[PDB]
Amino acid sequence: SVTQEDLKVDRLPGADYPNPSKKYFRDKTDYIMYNPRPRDEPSSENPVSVSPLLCELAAARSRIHFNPTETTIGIVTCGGICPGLNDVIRSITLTGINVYNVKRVIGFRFGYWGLSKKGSQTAIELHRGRVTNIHHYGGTILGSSRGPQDPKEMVDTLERLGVNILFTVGGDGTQRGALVISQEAKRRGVDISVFGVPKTIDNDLSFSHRTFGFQTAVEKAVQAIRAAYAEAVSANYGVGVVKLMGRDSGFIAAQAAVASAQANICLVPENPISEQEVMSLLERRFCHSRSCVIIVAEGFGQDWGRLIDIGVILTEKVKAFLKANKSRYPDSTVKYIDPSYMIRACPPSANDALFCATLATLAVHEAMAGATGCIIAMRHNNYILVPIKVATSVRRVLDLRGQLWRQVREITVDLGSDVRLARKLEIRRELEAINRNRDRLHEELA
Amino acid sequence: AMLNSVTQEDLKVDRLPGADYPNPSKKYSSRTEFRDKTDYIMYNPRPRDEPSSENPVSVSPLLCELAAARSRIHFNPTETTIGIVTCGGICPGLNDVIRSITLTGINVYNVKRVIGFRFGYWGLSKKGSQTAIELHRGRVTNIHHYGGTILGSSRGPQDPKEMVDTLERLGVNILFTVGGDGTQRGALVISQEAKRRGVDISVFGVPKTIDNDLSFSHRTFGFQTAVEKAVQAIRAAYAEAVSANYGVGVVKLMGRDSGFIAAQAAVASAQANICLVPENPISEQEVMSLLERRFCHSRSCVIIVAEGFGQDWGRYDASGNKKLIDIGVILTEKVKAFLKANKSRYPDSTVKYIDPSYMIRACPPSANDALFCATLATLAVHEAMAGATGCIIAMRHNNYILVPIKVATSVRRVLDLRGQLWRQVREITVDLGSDVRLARKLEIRRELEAINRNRDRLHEELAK
Amino acid sequence: LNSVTQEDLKVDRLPGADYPNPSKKFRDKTDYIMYNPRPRDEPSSENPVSVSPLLCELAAARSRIHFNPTETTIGIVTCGGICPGLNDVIRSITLTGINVYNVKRVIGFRFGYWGLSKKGSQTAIELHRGRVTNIHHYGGTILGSSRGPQDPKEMVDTLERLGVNILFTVGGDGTQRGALVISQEAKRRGVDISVFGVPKTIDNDLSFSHRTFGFQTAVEKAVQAIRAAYAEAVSANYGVGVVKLMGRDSGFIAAQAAVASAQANICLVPENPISEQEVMSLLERRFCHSRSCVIIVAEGFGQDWGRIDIGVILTEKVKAFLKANKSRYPDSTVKYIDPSYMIRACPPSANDALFCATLATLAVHEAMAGATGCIIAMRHNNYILVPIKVATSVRRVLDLRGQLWRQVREITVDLGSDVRLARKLEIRRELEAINRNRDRLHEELA
Amino acid sequence: AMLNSVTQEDLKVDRLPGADYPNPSKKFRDKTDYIMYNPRPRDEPSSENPVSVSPLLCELAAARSRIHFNPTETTIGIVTCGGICPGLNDVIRSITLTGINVYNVKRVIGFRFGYWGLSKKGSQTAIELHRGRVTNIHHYGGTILGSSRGPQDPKEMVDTLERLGVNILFTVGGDGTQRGALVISQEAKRRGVDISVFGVPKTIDNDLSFSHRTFGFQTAVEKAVQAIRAAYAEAVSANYGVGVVKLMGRDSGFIAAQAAVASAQANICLVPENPISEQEVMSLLERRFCHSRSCVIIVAEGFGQDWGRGSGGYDASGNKKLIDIGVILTEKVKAFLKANKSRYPDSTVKYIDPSYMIRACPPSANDALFCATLATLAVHEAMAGATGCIIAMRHNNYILVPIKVATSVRRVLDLRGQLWRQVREITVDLGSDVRLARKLEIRRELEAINRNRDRLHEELA
Ligand SMILES: O=C1N=CCc2c1ccn2Cc1ccc(Cl)c(Cl)c1
Ligand SMILES: O=C1N=CCc2c1ccn2Cc1ccc(Cl)c(Cl)c1
Ligand SMILES: O=C1N=CCc2c1ccn2Cc1ccc(Cl)c(Cl)c1
Ligand SMILES: O=C1N=CCc2c1ccn2Cc1ccc(Cl)c(Cl)c1
């Protein structure tokens, strides 16, 4: 498992230049505890971490590795779009130009394709004028693509254009590629930093509590649920099925379910249940209600097909179930909602705009200080550096015993509950309230 | 050729016999002139002739009756029961119409009682009538802040005999039918079953069509909200498409039998390169030719498609359910097949399909639709209390009018491909008539002229 | 008015239409719409006759145009307070000129009429496709705006010097009066210039008009301001929210916002001047059986209240009234909200974006066809041309006997009601409802 | 110099005696668990686990296996006090639904218009909170209970609590409200009555200590950025246009600072932590107008309290009556521009107070989730006999803090920290050479337009 060695961040040799940024900084590496929980009860001596692990904190350094005015920064965006890609491009560019006064900033187009011999022709000049308002729009002005290119070709491009720092904005696959580029550079003894800004709307990066665009995604997911609910509650035995991202984890689905308070069933990859259990939950909902809203992560029920499109398959199976039971559900309506387009393709919330700008600015500070083969992450309210190797070796998933999942279980259908009993206590509370109103009203006359 | 045969007689709206009660909100003595009765607006306000010494004459002989609070009413307010039913697909502002019908009845006319029938015409059947809800001030206070209908909705008819049985049993004097063409045809059948038994009932339609394809009408409620939501869907499709090399966003924008949402959204957004509407059937080959032309000098394309486009395109799912036609899916598949067959010229390509139907129809209305819904509903109550029946309320040439259901359900509204809206769609969308290579040369000259000017002023600013 | 003749509605054309219209599949002669589409007589077998003799010229693309497209220079100026959609009008004028007519050049004059003065003309900007691409996503004007006039002689000097053939004047009544003075100075020197107004009034108080651009957006924002005022007021014991909602000379925004929101208890508009004492009487009546009150006030209300900022003065007078009556209103809270900034400075709704684009496109079509000394307006669902002289001679105001104002009176406090009686009926209706619920609940047990 | 003294004793949260009942919630904690106040190590990485720089441990909030109150005999009371804040209705809803749905408590009472609602007169207005009364209240700004500023007689209030059989009172409000909560707690202890008083902190300014985030703060920053966007549109539309926008910030500038960075459209950001003179402000404006025709100024309501003398008075909540710095700043900017009409021949200054729209909206979805989680854990811990404390969020975890220490210290911007550095990167800097900085600007632009000019020239043929 993970050792302190696994958390040591690579530095390019030498920090020969002063940091030009203004004293309105750090001379040594500071650390934060991976786990800030104590081993023992309160005692007369300072508490000791349950874990041996320390993470390096990200910050502007007093000494830097790259000579600012000779430095070329490169940027590439890869994979599915995510709210705040333009914020990361803008803030990397403006930190480079305004704070370090770097020679040049290059935007490589359509992911790693943009660093291939063919693709490198399309590379764009990122100046102040080119990034002024790009953060008001979803997508990426650079464009994106999936899948790799020859690392040899890509380092050929980097050398040819005199790129000293490449920022890799993308998911697990992109950062694995970043580490391969880093090592091809080291192999030829070229002075290049490769520095990852993690892109995962699902917030399933480890050594991390929050990735950029996640909070925006939850806002949009709740708006999709509000529409699904309006549709479902408008029909007799109405069912709204809404797919909410979640390739390998259910953080968006779980947070949206709790925030909206309108989901009756929440289906996540961490909690695989059968078609039969799902229909049993729907059956229980329809005992006391005329509508049901089902949230489903795209990674749920991958053992339900021969990704399979679980949104379509679930909708089809719910229809088949209700048709086979037309006896008890005489008329019924099942609506499928795929809001994926609207969740990923918007500009960020103001809180994600600030987060994106802070990730990007610290990524420039640390790369200028010779950090390489690492990502910037946010953990316990602090910015840290994590080596790509350990970051891509583990992933984050819902704890089904944790407080978030407990809140999902409190609002969603539970076969264990005495619905009909609970209703009797409900009616007593209501009667108490309307009796009080009845009295005050009777009083008010005369 | 088949022409519609509408005469002035066809536009006369039925009144229940007698207006024996004074209006408690419209006192005859608060008029400034005599004769509180029916005023008219011209169907077509365009003249036959040039300006001359005599007043201009309408190109049409038709006059529409204007909707308004009357000084004399047919129903005795405190003995009056109002019923409401919502039918078919939901539409932004259903709750606004329910709320405003209820509060006009209670607050303005002080009616005895308001009943909400549930899940469309099902709610007036013998079985369904058990579910009927009491609409008081407390039940409707904030319902206009939410999409859908608190009454619920369903498609398709019920036995008119059963439904009039329900209306008689509950003592319903006015039934408001909120729904489309099919719903209002049913309203007229209810009206006639009532007349047959000599029961004193007004049936009054509030038209529900998100597509704005009601005739004798320029605007139906929820349409403007739908266009707002359609433009937000297009903004997301564009962000996705422009982020890919040879990226295509296909977005379906309502439009069952007409393309008003698709056309207005295309022009409002200024981001659609192809706009496919039922009024303008073109072949799969013409569509791919437009995409091909777009990809000559761009790396992305956004395609708007109405659900009623290409019904002559193409011809049970795994669970044994019947598969609907879906031009959105079929178009997306055909665009992929075209790009795959031409991977030579479009080496990598991405096609994304977006169905924002859920978000377009299921939201609360814009403030402008909230006002419109409240005004339609309040005037519908005023006119039904004044004994109007077998008719709908519509908005035409900035005015509220009454139209008999028979006329209203005999004709539908469609884009004029020679009109100004469609011209604006053609100005923004790909045009095969342009010289690809020439047009591009002039583009670059204009750009070069601009950056040359900036380059000069910048050079000036230094040594100054 | 009882006056206004067909002559007053005749729109000036520059002499000659010697060029074909380069747009493709247009009108060969001028078509008309009736000013008043109401009939003189009862329905009869013969086509109805207008109550009015007046006909308005319809706006449309013409087959013959006055200006030679490739020799034509278009100028644009934006004047007075900003209004949602200014950038939409600038963009659509520019792109219609360039993309449809392929005009030589488009000039943006800066900070209103100042921009056409000898000093100001140096700041004039080149409007090409690149300069207007996304400007419609932002509030304000890229050209900038200013109030008040310049020397017409100087301005025509500028127009002649820059070879401007069509000047579009985007502004209110004062701006268009200036446009007509420019037009006549041009005619006097025999310079071939069209001056064509796009009316800018957030208040929608242009005559020969049912809707001006930005009005609908303003009502959306006004309703959002009222929603916040209501939340504040209803949260306090004897809470009062006063919100000022534009309305310099008319109350269309205030009236539509009051009805759309359904949360205003008092609506104060210039058309209905009432005394300080009547206002306090309405508040007094509201506080008989409610603990909160929301007051909408147009900026043009109560200009006979000073021996003036009516928002501040009204708020002060409401506080003085509540303080003098602290006996009956023991603790009380008065909040003033001026949302003017947020109402005028936003981008338009999608419906206003479409309207702006349509006004602007037709304005270019008609100016290219030699229309001058006129504005484009929308009336009875149609686009018309109106001479500036008649357009600036009359203004539009609320009809206090109309359906809109009736809806305002239905929701706002009414002194005409019996306080005591009205309340008794209220309580009976409530008791009826809660008695039914009380029964069904009692039933449901067993 | 003067340092704060916080000890482990100050962080020990009071428990009512006895936990005699099992927790009816189903599929937790059998003893009190802790998190480090400061998770930074004393030493370099070594063979031994790292040791905290601080001796302080905070008690973690959680559902307990043993509870103090017998659920079906328990009455929960709720009161909302002071200025409204996005998410008040979310806290009321979640306290109510946790009480009813999880613990099946006897009864939930909503006291109206703050502490007034627990007075003899006010207690008549108290409302019954059931599932039906709170179903959608979280979709609206304000409080369905209503709010008021300032105190009531503690004797009267405990009279009300005893009369209605209230076992737990939740106090939703600021520093002043929670000081009142402690006074209620002690009046109860004095009479030996079994009551828990448990605070949910309400501060839009996020200036609670032992805390990184209070509810409604993130929503406030969203609304502040919308206000700045409108101010910018107005200012950039005028020749020498100035938008002055006031952004909350009574004693700290977290809203102003985060809004300035999020918007990237503020040229000057004025916060209580950084008092500067009228002359320095006008110097920053002067520098902005050297190479721009517009300026946006953010000002916290607590900035420049040494720019005038106030009345000496106190508002109903017992806070200083502040001078209106928004109006005074706007007036001084106008006076400066008028006195310099020579160099700023026409100028326009607009003042924007968006306070109404910032505090009176429903929460963002992220604030709705936060509010629900604070409220649910507050019920869990009060049922487990926690009293005289608040629930707070720190280092991504929920903790309990005694009111006494929570009301003794407040949180303020670090002018040497990363947030304020980002504010300084975007706002006007007198330290730059105006003339030199401009020359380099133009060179970079010329380089860019030369590249575009080339690619365009290429593209023909
Ligand atoms: O194999 C994986 N599949 C999914 C997710 C995953 C994996 C490894 C790490 N992670 C989490 C992760 C997500 C994004 C980034 Cl940028 C990184 Cl470096 C790791
Ligand atoms: O088949 C149709 N498809 C669309 C529209 C349509 C049809 C028939 C009449 N009409 C027009 C219409 C639409 C709505 C209503 Cl409520 C009415 Cl009465 C007619
Ligand atoms: O003095 C006026 N106050 C308000 C309205 C008004 C006046 C004069 C004409 N009008 C109508 C009007 C409004 C805007 C425009 Cl652009 C025009 Cl041309 C006329
Ligand atoms: O006197 C203060 N003025 C402002 C802020 C402050 C004070 C004391 C503690 N605090 C921080 C604080 C804020 C809110 C709450 Cl609910 C609490 Cl308990 C403390």
Numbering used by the authors:
A (entry chain C): 23 to 46, 52 to 333, 346 to 485
B (entry chain A): 19 to 333, 338 to 486
C (entry chain B): 21 to 45, 52 to 333, 347 to 485
D (entry chain D): 19 to 45, 52 to 485
Question: What did the paper state?
Answer:
In this stage of its life cycle, the parasite mitochondrion is highly compromised and cannot carry out oxidative phosphorylation and T. brucei exclusively uses glycolysis as the sole source of ATP. Trypanosomatid PFKs have been characterised by X-ray crystallography and two conformational states have been identified that fit with a classical description of an allosteric enzyme that transitions from an inactive T-state conformation to an active R-state conformation. The carboxyl groups of the two Asp residues hydrogen bond with the F6P substrate and also coordinate a catalytic magnesium ion, facilitating transfer of a phosphoryl group from ATP.
Over 30 X-ray structures of TbPFK complexed with ligands from most of the different scaffold families have been determined, and all show the conserved binding of the dichlorophenyl group locked in the allosteric pocket as observed in the structure with CTCB-12. The X-ray complexes clearly explain the SAR that strictly limits the size of substituents on the phenyl ring. Chlorine in the meta position is ideally positioned to make a specific electrostatic interaction with a carbonyl oxygen of Gly197 lining the allosteric pocket. The geometry of this ‘halogen bond’ with a Cl…O distance of 3.3 Å and C–Cl–O angle of 150° is in the expected range.
